[PDB]
Each structure stands twice: as structure tokens, then as C-alpha cells.
Amino acid sequence: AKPQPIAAAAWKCNGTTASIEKLVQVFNEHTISHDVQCVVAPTFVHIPLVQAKLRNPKYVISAQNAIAKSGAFTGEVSMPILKDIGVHWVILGHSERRTYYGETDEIVAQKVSEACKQGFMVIACIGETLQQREANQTAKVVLSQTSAIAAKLTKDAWNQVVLAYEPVWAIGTGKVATPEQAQEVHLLLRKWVSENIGTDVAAKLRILYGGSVNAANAATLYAKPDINGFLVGGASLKPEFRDIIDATR
Amino acid sequence: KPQPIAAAAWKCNGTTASIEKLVQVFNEHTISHDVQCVVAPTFVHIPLVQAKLRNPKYVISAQNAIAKSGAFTGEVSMPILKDIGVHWVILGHSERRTYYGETDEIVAQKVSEACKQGFMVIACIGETLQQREANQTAKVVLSQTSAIAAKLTKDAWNQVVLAYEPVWAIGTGKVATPEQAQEVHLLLRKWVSENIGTDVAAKLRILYGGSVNAANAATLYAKPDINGFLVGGASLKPEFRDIIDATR
Ligand SMILES: [Cl-]
Incomplete structure (x- = not known):
């Protein structure tokens, strides 16, 4: 009954030609063997390299x-340029x-809407800060x-559209x-989508967890009913990402 | 006059077909003269240009x-540029x-880190119409x-390479x-003359970053303190060759 899992590797601004070639071979x-959509998200200059090696x-x-x-728009990459090179996914609204x-x-909502109009699959990120979590505003923010x-x-x-919950309150804060706290926000979001957009839309929507994910807590995280996969950070730059994908079965 | 520079500021434009075609024209x-020509494509197009532009x-x-x-999601670092073989960078563009x-x-720190890492930097400065109309042309570019x-x-x-952008002329009518470009180039080199050193000012490349095409590049480079161009819309056209030849 769960929708198709997604395991996204968010390399962020990291990588060398040797690093990526060695890692992509591991991937x-x-x-x-199970139905799961895997995603590598490298820096712009590494997209051609990943395109050449990722198989x-x-x-x-x-x-x-x-x-x-x-x-x-000096320094920026546009969505039409990304379609021309063969890239159909884009992460928008990351906390960073x-x-x-x-x-x-x-700005983020305009990027998601224009990406959807241009045929992109979108991983849109939402999350709340500690100060916001301290004020009992988790719902207030992530629903806004x-x-x-x-x-x-x-x-x-x-x-x-794919949603990725970033527990920003649990990032670099100690x-x-x-x-359980992740499953709470993940169901909070699906019920808003169920109520405001549609019931069929909620059941099929993929809500990814964008917090600390490693080989030890991935399966237990995916065990929750409203978690549809992960937006992995540090572990995605490692062969450990394979185990994280294994845990989405 | 030191070595001129002809830089192609493609901005966020291009496809694989149009870039491959234009690179072949280049x-x-x-x-056959002493000039450093520069092509600055989007991050996604850097590997294509490195392979094809010969x-x-x-x-x-x-x-x-x-x-x-x-x-830092979405950003490209300077070490990543060095690993892939990129040694030049445009920093502080007006956009x-x-x-x-x-x-x-923020532009100052980026330029400093880039030079520390062995980068050639084209650092961009320029004033707005509001600033120029407030008699702030010198105040802004020197600051x-x-x-x-x-x-x-x-x-x-x-x-470091300085590139003056007449931002007061972009989308303003x-x-x-x-003569207005030479005036800014002069006072730029003159401040470097009197705060960095007469030696650095002489060998500093100060590129014009306004409207440059085949019809005016020669008249512009004929000015004594203009050392090349940071070319916009004309850089995506074969007439970038005429701009290069105008730096002779
Ligand atoms: Cl590992």
C-alpha cells in the first residue's frame, strides 16, 4: 500500500573525479531487487561525469x-539547460x-511550480528550526x-512532487x-495533503526523511508507515548508501 | 599595455548543440597575437568546453x-574546480x-580565497544609475x-583581473x-597606482564589461587604460572572433 520508495544520495558540494568514479562503481x-527509485545528486560540474559512469x-x-x-543569471543553472543535458530531477528548497x-x-514555491511545468520530478524540502520547535511551531512552519x-x-x-522533511532542529545543534519524531511530522504532512489536495494524492505521495540516516537506523526509520525513503547526506558519499537502499525493502 | 584578455561571459545560456557549434567556430x-581568451560557461557545460575547445x-x-x-547544496567549490581542471573564475559579477x-x-573574501588556491580571478565592479546620478561613480567602484x-x-x-561593468547602462535605457569607459578605467588604475603600487597598476588588466560587439571593440580597446572585454550577448555569437581580433 506504500508508494514506491526513494533513496536519494545528496552529495552536496563534495567530490573529486577519483572520488566519484570509485563511488559510482560501488553503486x-x-x-x-525491489522496486525503489534511487537518486544521485552531485554538483553541477560533476553531472557529466556521473552521467558517463552511473549505470x-x-x-x-x-x-x-x-x-x-x-x-x-551569472553563476546559476537554469531548468531548460538541465533538460537539454538530460537531467529530469531537481532538489528545491533545501534548508542550506x-x-x-x-x-x-x-522563491521555493515558484521553483517547484516552474519545474513541474517543465516536466521535472521535484524533491522539495521543508523543515523547522530548533527555535521554531521550541515554540510549538513544527506544524505552523512545515504546513506554511x-x-x-x-x-x-x-x-x-x-x-x-516529492517532499523531504529536514529536521533542521537536529542539524549541528547537538x-x-x-x-518516532520523524514519523510524527511525516504523518502531519500527509494529513494536510489528504485534507487540502486529495486522498489519492496523499496515499501516493512520497515523503522522504532528510535527517541523520546510516546503515543502523535506516530500516527502523523505513519501518514507519508514512516514511517513503530518505534524503541521505554524509552516508551517501560512502558504500554505506547501498545498505540504506537495502533498508527500503 | 599588458596582455589583453577577451572573456566570453555566457551567463546562464547555452545548449550542447549551440555550444559545440560555436566552440568549433572558435x-x-x-x-596570432599575445592575448588570453576566456570562455565562461555554466557549471554543467564546463566538461563539454574543456573537451571540445582546443x-x-x-x-x-x-x-x-x-x-x-x-x-552547501547547489554550490560549486573552488577545490572541486581545481580537481576538474578549472583555474579561472569570475567573482563579484553584478548579477x-x-x-x-x-x-x-563577500566578493572580497571569495577573491582572496581564490587567489590563495592558485586561481586567476576576474573580479567585477561597477555602479548603478542611482549611484552614478548621485556623483558616486568613483565612490562605488573604488570602495x-x-x-x-x-x-x-x-x-x-x-x-587578479578587474572588470568594470557599467551597471548604470544595463536595462536602463x-x-x-x-570616453565614459576610459574615464572609469583611468581612475581605477590610478587608485591602484596610489594604494597598491605603481608596479601593479601598470600590469593590471582592467576589462570593459559593457556592450561590446565587432563595431565598437576596436574603438574601445584603442583607449589607453582598457585592457580587453568581458563580453555578454556577443560572446555567444561567431562575432566574438572579431572582438578578439580587435584586441590586436
Ligand atoms: Cl561505507
């Missing part, structure tokens, strides 16, 4: 960011972009972030997030 | 970078100063340059004359 020799049939390639339109580079709900995105989409566009 | 254009007079630059690798939070101090200069040693200036 390719890993035989995966495992379970995988697609995603950009870590994009802008909606080509033009006078909302924090360091000032991406707002209006999810409503802003939904306000620019129609029903059919939700088949391209605080930890339990598999 | 490949069939023989350049003119010995060209190098490949990035349009942006950050100092260190790590948990990033305007729309992506690159303050004078942008002095922030960059406070993070650089004398030897690091041999890796105003246009910049060569």
Missing part, C-alpha cells in the same frame, strides 16, 4: 538546485539554500512551507531526532 | 564559486552582487576595489560611451 555493482538501472540523476529560466542563500517560500508550494500547483502536478 | 579562428589561446573560467567544499547577496565583503584589495597581497594581484 553500479550493487544489485537491487545501475535503479538510479536517476538530480540537480541540487536550479532556476526557472535561462538568461542573465533557505538558510545560507536566502531562499524564501515564494507546504501550503505555499501547493498554492502554485494543480492536482496532476503532484505526481512529480540535538537528536527519533524515528 | 576552434577554426586562428589567433584553441591554445583559450582558457575556461567558472562564473562563480565558493571557497570550501562541504554541506550576483544584485540578486544573490554578494556584498563587497568595491578597496574591499577586494584589503584581502590581497602584492603577489596575489598578479592573478542609458548607454555608455568609450
